Write a structure and sequence with these properties.
The structure is cut from a larger assembly and holds 2 copies of chain A.
Chain A lengths: L1 H22 L57 H8 L1 H6 L21
PDB class: flavoprotein
Keywords: glutamate synthesys, complex, oligomeric assemblies, flavoprotein
Entry title: Structure of Azospirillum brasilense Glutamate Synthase in a4b4 oligomeric state.
């Protein structure tokens, strides 16, 4: 039943809310990228050599760019010959008639004829 | 035209060359056509003019695409009364297919043609 999955995700978010409130923050953006909030506790009775988890807590300073920051929308990409076609073939996309086009093709141009 | 003299612009050999080159798609044949046409002794004003420049030649790939040139030519009007409807329709279809502007003429146009097939 989908209601089961809805309730499952509701419960997960509820627990996250509770633990984050108990921690002392107000949102998730305030915690992503922070490793100076974790600590290591060991099992003394096992006597094994303590697993050196220290490198997993190595924190490098981000500088000016935030640790979580990300731009909006997908990353851009240069245009190929396809653009030159979609401007010269607009009568096709407005009326739906036959078309015959001719061009010169260099090797640098990639994926000729996918946007159309 | 007669074999005696009075050179013309369209003789038999040139017509056959153009027709074979356009029906066989052999661009080399069209080049042979153009060489046959330009080789004739002067007959018009535009055969008394040479063209030169000063810069270095540029490889043919840098010249703008063929379609940006084909979209410049037009087909002058031809009345539907003069030529049969078949030729009119064929010209219209071809020119509107490559993207240029064809012409109707004086004899008007059938209304049933005002929509794409």
């Amino acid at each position: 039943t989908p209601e089961k999955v809805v309730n499952l995700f509701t419960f997960l978010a509820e627990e996250v809310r509770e633990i984050l409130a108990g921690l002392g923050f107000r949102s998730l953006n305030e915690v992503i990228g922070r490793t100076d909030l974790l600590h290591q506790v060991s099992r003394g009775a096992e006597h094994l050599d303590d697993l050196d988890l220290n490198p997993r807590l190595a924190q490098v300073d981000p500088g000016e760019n935030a640790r979580y920051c990300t731009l909006q929308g997908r990353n851009e990409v240069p245009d190929t010959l396809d653009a030159r076609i979609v401007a010269d073939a607009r009568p096709l996309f407005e009326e739906g008639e036959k078309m015959q086009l001719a061009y010169n093709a260099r090797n640098t141009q990639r994926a000729i004829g996918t946007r159309l | 035209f007669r074999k005696s003299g009075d050179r013309h612009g369209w003789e038999g050999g040139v017509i056959h060359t153009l027709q074979q080159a356009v029906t066989n798609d052999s661009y080399t044949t069209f080049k042979k056509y153009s060489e046959q046409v330009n080789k004739r002794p002067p007959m018009q004003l535009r055969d008394l003019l040479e063209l030169r420049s000063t810069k270095a030649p540029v490889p043919v790939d840098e010249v703008e695409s063929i379609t940006a040139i084909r979209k410049r030519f037009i087909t002058p009007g031809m009345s539907m009364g003069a030529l049969s409807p078949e030729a009119h329709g064929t010209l219209n279809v071809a020119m509107n297919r490559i993207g240029a502007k064809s012409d109707s003429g004086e004899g008007g146009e059938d209304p049933a043609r005002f929509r794409p097939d």
